[PDB]
């Protein structure tokens, strides 16, 4: 399993979206400022009709009794929910939310779908934590309080504590202002003081969503994946057992830790780290540390239902089909690491590594099962290695 659990993330994607601004016959009712989703004053019995079934549809209304009292009513399958609705210079239901409508319903619905399914899980996140050994709070080189602050993450982010997904559209969790940490609102309570405010000058590259890293650094492909390969190709392209042999684990850590600031885009060479299996390791590491797999989860399933054709003519075309359903960042990263990788195949006369060969060492890391249905999951691990091998083989045909 990966340090970064995917249950929540997995959920949010399943979560229902504001299935209806469900506007009125343009009645333009007078008492009302912001909205066209406002059906003025009406009865619960009449409102419900407007929504009806459509889990996710929402509407706004005023109290037939007490004036100036508006309330939001969105459907959540099981039934219909009325929430109230204020405006502190910006729309907002309960929670110290404060948004800009829809964002509300959206996030609200998310908070609903998740909390409903496995709220128990969301509670035990505190138990058996993981913050202890995650990074730089273990490596790198007394008491102090955390000046935590609510923060809206732009890009999937995970709690450096319960190492779980921070769901929500803008809710998110908190990011200490001094040490740069980022965790769940709750978890903030359970996270020990410690904190090293100069450990913020870091800016981790290893471990944040692929697409996000790329977009933020302006580069299509993770600058690590780039540099790494550069070297591996410069040096040991003909070293034996490339990517199969492991390097000093504790030396790979040193590399990663190097990409994370300390050099970031300006890391390091051939000497300093002579056993290239380190680098080959670090690179493997990088793919291992992604919160979302290069092959994604939403694709994992479909990528398997391809390595099952047996008729190599359709396999390839199948693979391509789904290879296309991949998010830009992922795709591009895969593409690249399926050359300055598959060029390794053009060398098994010196490194003993080939498609089928590498397809092993990578399958397991460039792919991951959604989980929570573990049974045939083991009867699939095979195909993973296949897929990879296949991609390395027919490299210049797919991209
Ligand atoms: Zn957490
Ligand atoms: Zn701090």
UniProtKB/Swiss-Prot annotation:
> What's an example of a GO molecular-function annotation for this chain?
zinc ion binding
Q: In which tissues is it expressed?
A: Highest levels in the brain and pancreas. Also expressed in the heart, placenta, and weakly in the kidney and liver. Expression is much reduced in the malignant gliomas, compared to normal brain or low-grade astrocytomas.
Gene Ontology cellular component list: cytosol; membrane; synapse
Residues covered by the SH2 domain: 37-105
Kindly name one Pfam family recorded for this protein.
C1_1
Zinc finger intervals, Phorbol-ester/DAG-type: 145-195
Q: Which InterPro entries match?
A: C1-like_sf (IPR046349), Chimaerin_SH2 (IPR035840), CHN1/CHN2 (IPR017356), DAG/PE-bd (IPR020454), PE/DAG-bd (IPR002219), Rho-type_GAP (IPR051854), Rho_GTPase_activation_prot (IPR008936), RhoGAP_chimaerin (IPR037860)
Report the superkingdom from the record: Eukaryota
Gene Ontology terms: biological process? acrosome assembly; regulation of small GTPase mediated signal transduction; signal transduction
User: Site feature Arginine finger: at which residues?
Assistant: 244
Keyword Zinc listed? The answer is yes
Main localisation, per the record? membrane
Q: Which Gene3D superfamilies match?
A: 3.30.60.20, Rho GTPase activation protein, SH2 domain
* Activity: how regulated: In the inactive state, the N terminus protrudes into the active site of the Rho-GAP domain, sterically blocking Rac binding. Phospholipid binding to the Phorbol-ester/DAG-type zinc-finger/C1 domain triggers the cooperative dissociation of these interactions, allowing the N-terminus to move out of the active site and thereby activating the enzyme.
Q: Keyword annotations for this protein?
A: GTPase activation, Membrane, Metal-binding, SH2 domain, Zinc, Zinc-finger
Q: State the name under which the record lists this protein.
A: Beta-chimaerin
Q: Which organism is it from?
A: Homo sapiens
Read off the lineage from the record.
Eukaryota, Metazoa, Chordata, Craniata, Vertebrata
């Amino acid at each position: 399993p990966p340090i970064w659990k995917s249950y929540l993330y997995q959920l949010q994607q399943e979560a229902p979206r504001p299935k209806r601004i469900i506007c009125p016959r343009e009645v333009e009712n007078r008492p009302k400022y912001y909205g066209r989703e406002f059906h003025g004053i009406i009865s619960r019995e009449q409102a419900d009709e407007l929504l009806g079934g459509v889990e996710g549809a929402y509407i706004l209304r005023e109290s037939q009794r007490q004036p100036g009292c508006y309330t939001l009513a969105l459907r959540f399958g099981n039934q219909t929910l009325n929430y109230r609705l204020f405006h502190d210079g910006k729309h907002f239901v309960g929670e110290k939310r404060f948004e800009s409508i829809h964002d509300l319903v959206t996030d609200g619905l998310i908070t609903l779908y998740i909390e409903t399914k496995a709220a128990e899980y969301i509670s035990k996140m505190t138990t058996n934590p993981i913050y202890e050994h995650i990074g730089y709070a273990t490596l790198l080189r007394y008491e102090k309080t955390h000046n935590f602050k609510v923060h809206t993450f732009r890009g999937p982010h995970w709690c450096e504590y319960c190492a779980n997904f921070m769901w929500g559209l803008i809710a998110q969790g908190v990011r200490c202002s001094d040490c740069g940490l980022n965790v769940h609102k709750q978890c903030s309570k359970h996270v020990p003081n410690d904190c090293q405010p100069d450990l913020k000058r870091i800016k981790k590259v290893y471990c944040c969503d692929l697409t996000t890293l790329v977009k933020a650094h302006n580069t299509q492909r993770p600058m690590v994946v780039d540099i790494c390969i550069r070297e591996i190709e410069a040096r040991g392209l003909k070293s034996e057992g490339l990517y199969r042999v492991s390097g000093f684990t504790e030396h790979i850590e040193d590399v990663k830790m190097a990409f994370d600031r300390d050099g970031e885009k300006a890391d390091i060479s051939a000497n300093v780290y002579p056993d290239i299996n380190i680098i080959t390791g670090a690179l493997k590491l990088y793919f291992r540390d992604l919160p979302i797999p290069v092959i994604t989860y939403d694709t994992y399933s479909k990528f398997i239902d391809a390595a099952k054709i047996s008729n190599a003519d359709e396999r390839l075309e199948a693979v391509h089909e789904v290879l296309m359903l991949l998010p830009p960042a992922h795709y591009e990263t895969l593409r690249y690491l399926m050359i300055h990788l598959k060029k390794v195949t053009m060398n098994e006369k010196d490194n003993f590594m080939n498609a089928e060969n590498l397809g092993i060492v990578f399958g397991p890391t460039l792919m991951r099962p959604p989980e929570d249905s573990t049974l045939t999951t083991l009867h699939d691990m095979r195909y993973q290695k296949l897929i990879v091998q296949i991609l390395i083989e027919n490299e210049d045909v797919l991209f």
